[model samples]
Target chain A: PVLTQSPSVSAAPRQRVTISVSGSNSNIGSNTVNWIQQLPGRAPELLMYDDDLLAPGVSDRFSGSRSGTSASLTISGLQSEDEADYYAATWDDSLNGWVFGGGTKVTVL
Target chain B: PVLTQSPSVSAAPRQRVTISVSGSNSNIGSNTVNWIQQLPGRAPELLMYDDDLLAPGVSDRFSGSRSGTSASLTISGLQSEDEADYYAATWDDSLNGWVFGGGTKVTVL
Candidate 1:
């Protein structure tokens, strides 16, 4: 699928913000959905994906789910520490590329 | 393919720095690879991927190339905007997930 980048950047420390995916297959596959957090001066860390499954040693605070190709990452108990750039990615067959959402930024209140 | 992790963050200001990928393969694949930049409070924009192919409107400063599963993102004319987290993501069949490198931090020096 031809992934489209999001039109604009979003601010967060948001209230369960929703990021959408376009050009994804309507049906869910064994493929897992995932999110990564990139804070300033750090590498991206696996947040959530695969129906809310998080990487080992990662906090359960971050969660993810997929409805078709549209996936959302909801960080519970949003804190200043959660502020950063968030990305949604999944496997794609035709593209042979890991499909990623344009991205959303979460700002601290 | 099972993705491995990279350790430690690196610093840079304006030299063409090389970020390398270690994986089991050779020859760049048609599947476009891309890099992303994220500041403290901003969203990520595409950098480079697919044997140095860049995104539309992306500055020539950022470029990418691959020698097998190992890919490298080199930023020329690095500006402050290039300071942030850098991630390498690719498609993985076994995990049915986007295998990501642990990450690298670019500090302005």
Candidate 2:
């Protein structure tokens, strides 16, 4: 099971950025959507937990939303520090495993 | 809560290799372990999810084991294709989030 994502997105500082994640309907509906942020040369940090739950130290500027067979991570008030690779993940009950997006690089212009 | 791992490991083709992950009692002891593999310049692929569950399209040579607050991912009859960065992650019930190890780079000598 492959969870697909957009390749890249660009936004200006203080703007809003959204990244999309798509999976099978059953998988999306039954499991939670988690998001990750990875800066250059650093390991990924958790951005969202269980769909809309923001992780500790994650600013309120970031949020997650899901509907149907897809989900999106929205970053409001984006800053230069927010420029990084974003990835979405969810558990696939049918496969008894986890699936991750190809990652979308957010470029802060 | 932090999940730690060895920095690197090396093994020859057809040899067996193992990567270790350690966490506190609050996390690994009570929660499940997951493993991810990242090839150079590629998004990570889930190798093991939810402790012992193997991901679809993953090889049987890859397996995970857990004891107390520690876990290990063992690769049996390793191949050159197995050379990559291995990450161990687990859910943190205390924080209601996920935590990942520092990652271990595997070298196929």
Candidate 3:
């Protein structure tokens, strides 16, 4: 199944928010999910991978988790710099390829 | 400096093609560049990294090389499936961020 996610999420500075990625038994439940962050007008950066392993040099404010057919990314103590588009990705055996969800825009209001 | 790449390229089926990414001393020379591929209606996948290291399970027809401040992704035998958008990415210490090149569309004619 294809990966899907909310189009956007918003939270005030210093607050915490979670972005979830939805899929079916073919994806989120079957393989690991990684998170990528893309700031406005910038290129996408890998934030976390292998389910919950943070990339080197990435901040601790970012975390990842999965349950059943869904995966989630949590940002603690969000700040203006955290405002960006977030994507959840996983490899699907049925498709024999990697799948990425529609990006979620995180607005730091 | 920011990473840059060609806007588009075309090649016949079974032909060979090479896409290049350009950068500067502050970025490509001082750090590493990675390549990502985004097929039509699909999410981006990590194709290569550390200038020339291929990701696991990738096709051997695809290879990477770097010289000077530029890096290249070469397809030995082009296929329609290879038609996709290619992006170059690297860490820009001068900017204190990860910079990505504008994508290059590789068309299989």
Candidate 4:
């Protein structure tokens, strides 16, 4: 039983923003976490995997981390292209199923 | 060239519910459209792929389709378990990236 994220977050270009996901230890602490970036009117693309590794072709400005049942994705020097919805996902131990955060919108202002 | 969906749709158990996705003929017509079913507190699962083919092990009650700029997912014999968020996705011809609809929440009432 774990999966929570803010509905949205705003930032200006060149600023940094962090999206968070909270869950129980059985899931968050035990499984690898992945992040997806979904642009408006476009498809969702994998952003990070294994909690921190940037997916191939992803920019270096992104990073991921997890500790104590919580995970985070940080974006630095944000670009307009980064404006999108971010979602965190992982296998849930309790539910015996995959789980996703409600998704957080990154509004580039 | 295309992507749009209703914010939500409602249905009752054992009934039929169809969620539609619309886009440009170039994109929705030539590209493969996939559907994902995201359950609350769980990870999103691929429900259909290749526009109309059910994923392996998927229930026969679920179906997919694409007609020119329009695509759809139909759920027959709707179950309370079908209550979830559904999304349609495909690669865009102009954007050279994947695109997704806003997603439709299937509320089984």
How well docked is model 2, in DockQ terms? 0.01
lDDT of each: 0.61, 0.86, 0.86, 0.85
Worst ten in a row by lDDT for model 2 chain A: A74-83
lDDT of 4 by residue, B1-109 (tens): 1488965978788798999999886578779899999999999999899988866546557788888888899988798878999999998888888988888999999
Listed per model in order, the count of residue pairs whose N, CA or C atoms clash below 3 Å is 4, 0, 0, 9
Candidate 3 achieves a global lDDT of 0.86
Checking candidate 3 for backbone clashes, the offending pairs are none
Q: Residues B1-109, candidate 1: write the lDDT tens digits.
A: 2334344345554556767666544222323455666667878766665557777656676677766567777766455545677777666555555666666677655
TM-score of each: 0.43, 0.49, 0.49, 0.49
**C-alpha displacement of B58 in model 1, angstroms?**
1.4
Candidate 1 docks at the CAPRI level of: incorrect
For model 3, residues A16-52, the per-residue Cα lDDT tens digits are 8899989988888889999999987768989999989
Per-residue lDDT tens digits of candidate 2, residues A7-108?
Answer: 798888767888998999657777889998998877898989889999975667788998888999998777666789998989888888888888999998
Candidate order by lDDT, highest to lowest? 2, 3, 4, 1
What DockQ does each listed candidate score?
Answer: 0.01, 0.01, 0.02, 0.01
Docking quality level of the chain pair in candidate 4: incorrect
Task: Report the candidate with higher TM-score, 1 versus 3.
Answer: 3
What is the C-alpha lDDT profile of model 4 across A1-109, one tens digit per residue? 2589866978887778999999887788899899988988877889899999998756677999999889999988776667899999998888899999999999888
Q: What ranges in model 1 sit over 4 Å off?
A: A1-109, B1-12, B25-32
Error of 4 at A13 (Å): 0.4
DockQ of 4: 0.01
> Which 10 residues in a row give candidate 1 chain B its minimum summed lDDT?
B23-32
Fraction of native contacts, model 4: 0.00
